[PDB]
């Protein structure tokens, strides 16, 4: 039982770029920098046309614009476009 | 009749974490710190797939990223996942 | 023909509170402070369930959280809940 | 192969105004200032009622409120309202 104000699969990272391209197969590509120095290009598990994709898209965007560390998890397989898929994001004050 | 610029169920709190997990039963879990020191885990009254859930999700997120105090009210019962449900948020400049 | 970086119905104002209450008849009530000192409570022209209401809801929220002056116009009649309805918002860098 | 934290059709610009007007033919007009000093008024490729239009609308808005440079591409033709249409936005931390 920790301090009320202290928080506490999920890797810590920074969201360093997002390219929104709803004309194309990727739809939106997220560039992520992990805490151990590796940089990875990733997609969202859901279509942007689905509200679940919109919700994941928004927390990632806010994390980039606030310059925040976040934690993410992915489905765990590279797809036919060459990227893993983000399916969970955690953000804290 | 108060100063034009002065504002004025609803408890004052801070939104200290949000975990967006649209694969799972909770969908999104909000960690809230009340002004009297108690910390509580909460859900939204509406599905994320519904625009009302999206609207509550956005004001909470903005409150976390701006480091703002807000006021919330809940439906008033713990559900089968162990959490109350947020149904109203008020935010001020 | 003005400087490329210089911008330029619409009244200038600040968005000083927003109360998101999708359980109730108002859905979301916006408290607005006009530049001449009068303060007014206002609704949105569109349902929150409609994407046009969502779009107006988002620019207002961003204006509150960034502490920005904006310009708004309304439909021009008080409705049966006692408020006018915002139908246009302009925001500038 | 560049530094992990270093990023890298698309023109660099600032988003200096947005006018959200879902009553009218334009729906939302974006004023953009390119790096070479020319200023241009632009629309979105998608309807605001479509989630793809909402996604492009949000990254533009965040870019304005964070005072960020971004890159955009357009469809490449002036339409019957006198404007080109934005179809891709890239934003970086």
Residue numbers in the entry:
A (entry chain A), B (entry chain A), C (entry chain A), D (entry chain A): 4 to 11, 20 to 104
What does the report in the manuscript say about this coordinate set?
Since we found that twin crystals are formed when CipA is expressed in E. coli, we applied CFPC to CipA with the addition of twin crystal inhibitors during the crystallization process and succeeded in obtaining suitable crystals and determining the structure of CipA at a 2.11 Å resolution. The structure was determined by the molecular replacement method using the search model created by AF231 via ColabFold35. The structure of the CipA monomer consists of the N-terminal arm followed by three β-strands β1, β2, β3, α-helix, and β-strands β4 and β5. This tetramer is consistent with the results of PISA36 prediction of oligomeric states and is considered the basic unit of crystal growth.
We have succeeded in determining crystal structures of two types of proteins with high-resolution using CFPC. The polyhedra crystal (PhC) produced in insect cells by infection of cypovirus (cytoplasmic polyhedrosis virus, CPV) is one of the most highly studied in-cell protein crystals.
